[PDB]
Structure formats: C-alpha cells, structure tokens
Design an enzyme around this catalytic site. Structure first.
Site, PDB file in Angstrom:
ATOM      1  N   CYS A  26       0.827  -1.209   0.000  1.00 39.68           N
ATOM      2  CA  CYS A  26       0.000   0.000   0.000  1.00 39.68           C
ATOM      3  C   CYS A  26       0.859   1.256   0.000  1.00 39.68           C
ATOM      4  O   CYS A  26       0.545   2.236  -0.675  1.00 39.68           O
ATOM      5  CB  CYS A  26      -0.929   0.019   1.217  1.00 39.68           C
ATOM      6  N   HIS A 165      -2.384   1.928   7.146  1.00 40.46           N
ATOM      7  CA  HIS A 165      -2.607   1.680   5.723  1.00 40.46           C
ATOM      8  C   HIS A 165      -2.347   2.923   4.870  1.00 40.46           C
ATOM      9  O   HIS A 165      -2.964   3.968   5.076  1.00 40.46           O
ATOM     10  CB  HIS A 165      -4.052   1.183   5.549  1.00 40.46           C
ATOM     11  N   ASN A 185      -7.561   3.845  -3.186  1.00 49.77           N
ATOM     12  CA  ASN A 185      -6.965   2.719  -2.471  1.00 49.77           C
ATOM     13  C   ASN A 185      -6.252   1.834  -3.496  1.00 49.77           C
ATOM     14  O   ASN A 185      -6.296   2.110  -4.695  1.00 49.77           O
ATOM     15  CB  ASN A 185      -8.068   1.933  -1.748  1.00 49.77           C
TER      16      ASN A 185
HETATM   17  C1  CRL Z   1      -0.069  -1.699   3.454  1.00 53.25           C
HETATM   18  N1  CRL Z   1      -0.470  -2.491   2.506  1.00 53.25           N
HETATM   19  C2  CRL Z   1       0.300  -2.106   4.817  1.00 53.25           C
HETATM   20  N2  CRL Z   1       0.866  -0.955   5.547  1.00 53.25           N
HETATM   21  C3  CRL Z   1       1.991  -0.226   5.436  1.00 53.25           C
HETATM   22  O1  CRL Z   1       2.838  -0.454   4.571  1.00 53.25           O
HETATM   23  C4  CRL Z   1       2.224   0.856   6.392  1.00 53.25           C
HETATM   24  C5  CRL Z   1       2.075   2.298   5.763  1.00 53.25           C
HETATM   25 SI1  CRL Z   1       2.090   3.715   6.886  1.00 53.25          SI
HETATM   26  C6  CRL Z   1       1.457   3.316   8.520  1.00 53.25           C
HETATM   27  C7  CRL Z   1       1.046   5.012   6.197  1.00 53.25           C
HETATM   28  C8  CRL Z   1       3.758   4.393   7.030  1.00 53.25           C
HETATM   29  N3  CRL Z   1       3.574   0.666   6.935  1.00 53.25           N
HETATM   30  C9  CRL Z   1       4.028  -0.325   7.750  1.00 53.25           C
HETATM   31  O2  CRL Z   1       3.199  -1.189   8.088  1.00 53.25           O
HETATM   32  N4  CRL Z   1       5.315  -0.407   8.206  1.00 53.25           N
HETATM   33  C10 CRL Z   1       5.749  -1.523   9.094  1.00 53.25           C
HETATM   34  C11 CRL Z   1       7.103  -2.131   8.611  1.00 53.25           C
HETATM   35  O3  CRL Z   1       8.089  -1.087   8.452  1.00 53.25           O
HETATM   36  C12 CRL Z   1       7.705  -0.049   7.508  1.00 53.25           C
HETATM   37  C13 CRL Z   1       6.351   0.614   7.915  1.00 53.25           C
HETATM   38  C14 CRL Z   1       1.402  -3.248   4.806  1.00 53.25           C
HETATM   39  C15 CRL Z   1       1.867  -3.749   6.195  1.00 53.25           C
HETATM   40  S1  CRL Z   1       0.453  -4.289   7.170  1.00 53.25           S
HETATM   41  O4  CRL Z   1      -0.067  -5.678   6.610  1.00 53.25           O
HETATM   42  O5  CRL Z   1       0.886  -4.398   8.692  1.00 53.25           O
HETATM   43  C16 CRL Z   1      -0.863  -3.049   6.996  1.00 53.25           C
HETATM   44  C17 CRL Z   1      -1.021  -2.641   5.501  1.00 53.25           C
END
Ligand code: CRL
Length: 218
Positions: A26, A165, A185
C-alpha cells in the site's frame, strides 16, 4: 480561498486503480500515485509508475520491508537518491518481494524532494490537495467497516489516529452535508466505490487521515 471541492481525476492526473493482492505494498502504491500526478503536471503524460520497483529496491536502507510494509516518505527519498523510478510497464507488479531490478533505461520519472504536512491539520491537507496535487496519507483501516465499505462517506466510531494503511487523497468535497476526502486505495476496482473510498473530513482527523501526509515534487 480554496475551492469547495476538488477531484484530480478530472484533471487527468490519476491512473487506473491498482490491485496489491496479498503483498502489503500500500505504501508503494500510495507513493507512485502521488508522483504519477506530479509527472502528469510536469510533462503532460499520465504514466503508471512501478510500485514493484519500490517494493524491490526501497528496502532496508529506507526502513522498508517490501510486502510487509514501508513508508511513502522514504520511498520518495529512494527515488530521489536513485535518480529515478521505472514505469510500471517496464517493471510490472508481481505482488511479491524480488531482487532489485531497477534500470535507468526504463526510467519514467524522477523526484527532487518531498514535503511532510504538519500532524493532524486537515485545513493544511485541504490546501495541499487543492494547490499541489494528490497527497499520500496513512489511515487506520484496522476495522471491519473499512474492508466492508461500499459507498457514501465513511465514518467509523472506533477509528483512531494510529494509522496502518497507506493510501492517496485525490480530492475532497461533500455529500449532502457530509464533508469527505476522496481516497484512492490499492485493493482493486471492486473495493468500495470502484477502487475509491470517501472518508470523513473535518471530523477530528478521523482515522488519522491527516496524521502523516506527504507529497513529492519533480
Ligand atoms: C499496506 N499495505 C500495509 N501498511 C503499510 O505499509 C504501512 C504504511 Si504507513 C502506517 C502510512 C507508514 N507501513 C508499515 O506497516 N510499516 C511496518 C514495517 O516497516 C515499515 C512501515 C502493509 C503492512 S500491514 O499488513 O501491517 C498493513 C497494511
């Protein structure tokens, strides 16, 4: 004076909705989406950029974990440091972590810098969306209602400012008195309003949509 409503899709700065699949990319899609608009504004061409390129190359050194998450800001810095990002066409999305296969011969865009908006200020976010272009943001999509969203202005009583997300704000407006942010999205065209979701605007930074906003510039 800002316009009451904005929709960057009308200005031809928004590409087709993508489908990330089981890969948590994402953040990558949010980032390319923001840059895709800037590329259009600068060159006149609308080109889908390689989210895969980010997943594969903007890795450990940028605090990212590929299909397990990443940041849009560090993704932007990678494009800057790397002096480019390939087109989606030349470096297609495979929804999996791969060895970095970036090649300057497939470059479709560059980035000179990025700006992070102040925490939780929806008025500043509105200004950026109206005057700069689509803005990458993070939202709290941990709730069932988000996954089940189909139409209208999304409001979740249990939403928090703890975002997880990455998405893209491509405009804003109001639906019968309910103000919203127009969000693109990356869960395919079958999610919500054909890939988009309108989220509550000016309702106390609902779901943390204005918590961590950022946009790149070419
Ligand atoms: C997407 N698809 C998922 N999220 C993310 O990539 C988020 C984005 Si933000 C909160 C807006 C910076 N980032 C992370 O989850 N990180 C954790 C690992 O280190 C980098 C930042 C993909 C991961 S998920 O399945 O936990 C939620 C959706």
């Amino acid at each position: 004076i800002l316009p009451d409503s904005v929709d960057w899709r009308e200005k031809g700065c928004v590409t087709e909705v993508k489908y990330q699949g089981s890969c948590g990319a994402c953040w990558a899609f949010s980032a390319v989406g923001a840059l895709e608009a800037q590329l259009k504004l600068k060159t006149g061409k609308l080109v889908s950029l390689s989210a895969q390129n980010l997943v594969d190359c903007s890795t450990e050194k940028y605090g990212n974990k590929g299909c397990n998450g990443g940041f849009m800001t560090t993704a932007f810095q990678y494009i800057i440091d790397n002096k480019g990002i390939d087109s989606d066409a030349s470096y297609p999305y495979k929804a999996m972590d791969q060895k970095c296969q970036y090649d300057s011969k497939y470059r479709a865009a560059t980035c000179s810098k990025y700006t992070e908006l102040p925490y939780g200020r929806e008025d500043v976010l509105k200004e950026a969306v109206a005057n700069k272009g689509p803005v990458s943001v993070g939202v709290d999509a941990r709730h069932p209602s988000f996954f089940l969203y189909r139409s209208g202005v999304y409001y979740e009583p249990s939403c928090t400012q703890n975002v997880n997300h990455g998405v893209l704000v491509v405009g804003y407006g109001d639906l019968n008195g309910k103000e919203y942010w127009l969000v693109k999205n990356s869960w395919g065209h079958n999610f919500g309003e054909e890939g988009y979701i309108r989220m509550a605007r000016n309702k106390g930074n609902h779901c943390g949509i204005a918590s961590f906003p950022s946009y790149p510039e070419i």
